[PDB]
Design a protein around this ligand. Structure first.
Ligand code: CLA
Ligand code: CLA
Ligand code: CLA
Ligand code: CLA
Ligand code: CLA
Ligand code: CLA
Ligand code: CLA
Ligand code: CLA
Ligand SMILES: CC1=C(C#C/C(C)=C/C=C/C(C)=C/C=C/C=C(C)/C=C/C=C(\C)C#CC2=C(C)C[C@@H](O)CC2(C)C)C(C)(C)C[C@H](O)C1
Ligand SMILES: CC1=C(C#C/C(C)=C/C=C/C(C)=C/C=C/C=C(C)/C=C/C=C(C)/C=C/C2=C(C)CCCC2(C)C)C(C)(C)C[C@H](O)C1
Lengths: 90, 172, 160
């Protein structure tokens, strides 16, 4: 009804292809699919290991293991980015 | 292809002109972040690291008047804990925070394409008035700064094993 | 032309080729290392390891490292440096698969340039055959240790 503002750098992200354009990856638009796939596997193993090392949680835990356990959900987004880049020829 | 790493491809973001270029970016991190931000970040890490390695050596060489009576034994990172009880660190923190506030404004101006990475125009003595000798001092700053990051990490970690401190650990 | 079970149809030939060369080189080091470990012992190691043979050394140094021993962190250090090397040379094996210039196994590592000097039409096959033997020989060495406490030289010397 009036112009709706969006921040500078807003681009068109609607896709009807097999995979979205690499622009949907933001700052990761230039990373290759091999690098996302290897980072995804790495993050999944390190995140699962760190998660496993602190499943009995105690009042004093190792702080690095806590931070490293956040790599398991991050790996899901990494392998989705690997599928997007492999189907974009990157 | 890349110079430093012959099997790997030349980094896209990196350029020959960018001081301290060896074509070294195997993981392609320069593609992820803005290259000027990484350049400013490397230059800043270089200068802090240079000061810290020189300080580590100097702390083994001598001690300013009265410091022996606040801290007796602690040499590298132990001194920081005693000084935070006093105002010594808080003071450095406050003034460096103030200097970094204008560093933040400088970063914003750089990221819009106007200022150059690490260029704060701080050249009181006449050391860069040639623009060929200037290029040599820029590259020397980056190489000495990179060496200093590795050194500062090396010295602090050696203190973590032994507690000796850098030069005394060299002696024994 | 040896592939009776057709396992190159079940994976990319480039990935398999680099994996084969890596297995061959690592096993070269393992087989040569076990024979050298019996023949020569680096100084000081007899107090940390005693007289343990190839696989026993891994478990015994990591047992000592499992206490807080400063003089037993060899395994972690080798693991660290090999992991660092595999992390930074990791994009190479994906560049080869993507159609890149570099062939499987070539990191251009020729300091002495012995391969560069003469035409390298045979040194490649020399490495591949020697490494294939190195893998099988490592297999031999480890399982024979797992049955009899003898090492390379001890087991070869007699015949139980
Ligand atoms: C990252 C840098 C860093 C940090 C955090 C510290 C921190 C400290 N040092 Mg170390 N030190 C440093 C650098 C550093 N110093 C340098 C560069 C030297 C000289 C080579 C020394 C030499 C030194 C000795 C000999 C001793 C300390 C001591 C101390 C402690 C007491 C605080 C004090 O009086 O320091 C004061 C430190 C200085 C005045 C040196 C600072 C010099 C740099 C070059 C400041 C330059 C500012 C710059 C020119 C402005 C640029 C402006 C531009 C950005 C526009 C504290 C732990 C004492 C201690 O507890 O040790 C046991 C002690 O005895 N320091
Ligand atoms: C953060 C750094 C730091 C700290 C915590 C101290 C702490 C101290 N200084 Mg020192 N001092 C420092 C840096 C520092 N100094 C620097 C950078 C200078 C300039 C070179 C001085 C110059 C100085 C003088 C000249 C004297 C002290 C003295 C003293 C002490 C007074 C009480 C005492 O020992 O008796 C106190 C322990 C006094 C003292 O007793 O020393 C003998 C004294 O006379 N200080
Ligand atoms: C320009 C203004 C300014 C002012 C007003 C102060 C004020 C102060 N500083 Mg700070 N300081 C400043 C700039 C300033 N600083 C800068 C630019 C630096 C270099 C980064 C420092 C580095 C510094 C250190 C390292 C230390 C102080 C300390 C102190 C205190 C002096 C200790 C005391 O009891 O006083 C009496 C002052 C005398 C000189 C008599 C002795 C006081 C809060 C000291 C402290 O322990 O705080 C309580 C201390 O160790 N200052
Ligand atoms: C080996 C040390 C070394 C070297 C060669 C340089 C060299 C340089 N610096 Mg850096 N710098 C250093 C350490 C060093 N710096 C440290 C430790 C700090 C922290 C206190 C800084 C903070 C700093 C700032 C804030 C600025 C510089 C700037 C400069 C440039 C112009 C000044 C000059 O010619 O200095 C020659 C210096 C030496 C021969 C070292 C003694 C030049 C490329 C300026 C710049 O990049 O603009 C072009 C600038 O504004 N430097
Ligand atoms: C400027 C770089 C530099 C330099 C000259 C040194 C130099 C040294 N380091 Mg340090 N180090 C560095 C960077 C550096 N380090 C960095 C970046 C790290 C990572 C945090 C370390 C971590 C480190 C640890 C954890 C230890 C050393 C140790 C040592 C000493 C013996 C190493 C050796 O010969 O056996 C190395 C073995 C080899 C097979 C080398 C090949 C030596 C004084 C040891 C020491 O005695 O310090 C207490 C030690 O325990 N270093
Ligand atoms: C998969 C290979 C492998 C593994 C896991 C081990 C593991 C071990 N060895 Mg064995 N060893 C190996 C290979 C291996 N070694 C090789 C290749 C040799 C030389 C023939 C030896 C000779 C050897 C001796 C003599 C001793 C050990 C010992 C040990 C233990 C402590 C670490 C140590 O000091 O090693 C020392 C190992 C070396 C110095 C060999 C390093 C050879 C490098 C890898 C050659 C690299 C060349 C090339 C230029 C690099 C290319 C880089 C490129 C990829 C970029 C540890 C269980 C010690 C022990 O506890 O035994 C009881 C001991 O006394 N090893
Ligand atoms: C590069 C391989 C290498 C080399 C040159 C040495 C050299 C040496 N070792 Mg040995 N050592 C090695 C690998 C090596 N070590 C490995 C891979 C381990 C296990 C991680 C050990 C564990 C070990 C122990 C437990 C001790 C030595 C000690 C020593 C030193 C004194 C000799 C002795 O006590 O007999 C000697 C210089 C001794 C030492 O430093 O005493 C001062 C000692 O107590 N070594
Ligand atoms: C039989 C051993 C053997 C042979 C013939 C080769 C041959 C080759 N390698 Mg490989 N390599 C090997 C072992 C070997 N490698 C091992 C074990 C490693 C792991 C450290 C490597 C790591 C490696 C990398 C990372 C790269 C190569 C490359 C190459 C090629 C060019 C380099 C060259 O000509 O060097 C010839 C190498 C030798 C003749 C090996 C020297 C063996 C000496 C004579 C003795 C070994 C001593 C050892 C410590 C054990 C002693 C015995 C013990 C029982 C006492 C060529 C096809 C490069 C490539 O493919 O492209 C250019 C490359 O980038 N290799
Ligand atoms: C690459 C390169 C470089 C390099 C390098 C390096 C590190 C080169 C290293 C090459 C190596 C380490 C070769 C080792 C091969 C071992 C073999 C073939 C063993 C087979 C064992 C068998 C068959 C057995 C057995 C049996 C015995 C005796 C024991 C029994 O209990 C068991 C059993 C009965 C089974 C350099 C620096 C030169 C530069 C150059 O520019 C590039
Ligand atoms: C915690 C704490 C404090 C503190 C503190 C401080 C000052 C902490 C500083 C920590 C630093 C600077 C650590 C840096 C470590 C460097 C590393 C790991 C580089 C390794 C190089 C590698 C892996 C490869 C290198 C490579 C090689 C060999 C081959 C190729 C070249 C290269 C790529 C270079 C206090 C003061 C608050 C006190 C408090 O009570 C305790």
């Amino acid at each position: 009804f009036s112009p709706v503002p969006s921040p500078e750098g807003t681009k068109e992200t609607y896709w009807e292809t097999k995979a979205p354009s690499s622009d949907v990856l933001g700052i990761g638009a230039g990373v290759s699919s091999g690098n996302f796939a290897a980072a995804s596997v790495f993050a999944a193993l390190v995140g699962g290991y760190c998660t496993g090392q602190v499943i009995p949680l105690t009042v004093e835990p190792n702080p690095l293991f806590l931070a490293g356990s956040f790599l398991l959900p991050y790996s899901w987004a990494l392998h989705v980015a690997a599928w997007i880049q492999k189907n974009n020829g990157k | 292809m890349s110079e430093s790493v012959p099997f790997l491809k030349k980094p896209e973001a990196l350029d020959s002109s960018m001081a301290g270029y060896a074509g070294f970016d195997p993981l392609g991190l320069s593609s992820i972040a803005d290259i000027k931000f990484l350049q400013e970040s490397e230059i800043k890490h270089c200068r802090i690291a240079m000061l810290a390695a020189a300080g580590s050596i100097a702390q083994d060489i001598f001690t300013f008047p009265g410091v022996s009576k606040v801290v007796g034994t602690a040499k590298m990172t132990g001194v920081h804990d005693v000084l935070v009880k006093q105002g010594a660190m808080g003071q450095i923190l406050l003034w460096t925070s103030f200097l970094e506030v204008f560093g933040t404004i400088a970063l914003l101006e750089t990221l819009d394409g106007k200022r150059a990475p690490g260029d704060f125009k701080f050249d009181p003595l006449g050391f860069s008035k040639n623009a060929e000798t200037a290029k040599r001092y820029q590259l020397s700053e980056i190489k000495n700064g990179r060496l200093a990051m590795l050194a500062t990490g090396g010295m602090v970690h050696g203190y973590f094993i032994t507690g000796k401190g850098p030069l005394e650990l060299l002696t024994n | 032309g040896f592939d009776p079970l057709g396992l190159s149809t079940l994976c990319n030939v480039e990935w398999l080729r680099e994996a084969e060369i890596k297995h061959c080189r690592v096993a070269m080091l393992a087989a040569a290392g076990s024979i050298a470990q019996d023949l020569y012992q680096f100084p000081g190691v007899e107090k940390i390891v005693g007289s343990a043979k190839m696989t026993g050394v891994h478990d015994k140094i990591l047992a000592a490292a499992s206490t807080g021993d400063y003089k037993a962190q060899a395994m972690s250090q080798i693991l660290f440096w090999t992991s660092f090397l595999e992390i930074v040379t990791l994009p190479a094996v994906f560049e080869t698969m993507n159609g890149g210039p570099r062939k499987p196994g070539v990191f251009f590592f020729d300091p002495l340039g012995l391969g560069k000097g003469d035409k390298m039409g045979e040194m490649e096959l020399k490495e591949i055959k020697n490494g294939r033997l190195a893998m099988i020989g490592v297999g031999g060495m480890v399982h024979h240790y797992l049955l009899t406490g003898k090492g390379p030289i001890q087991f070869l010397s007699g015949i139980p």
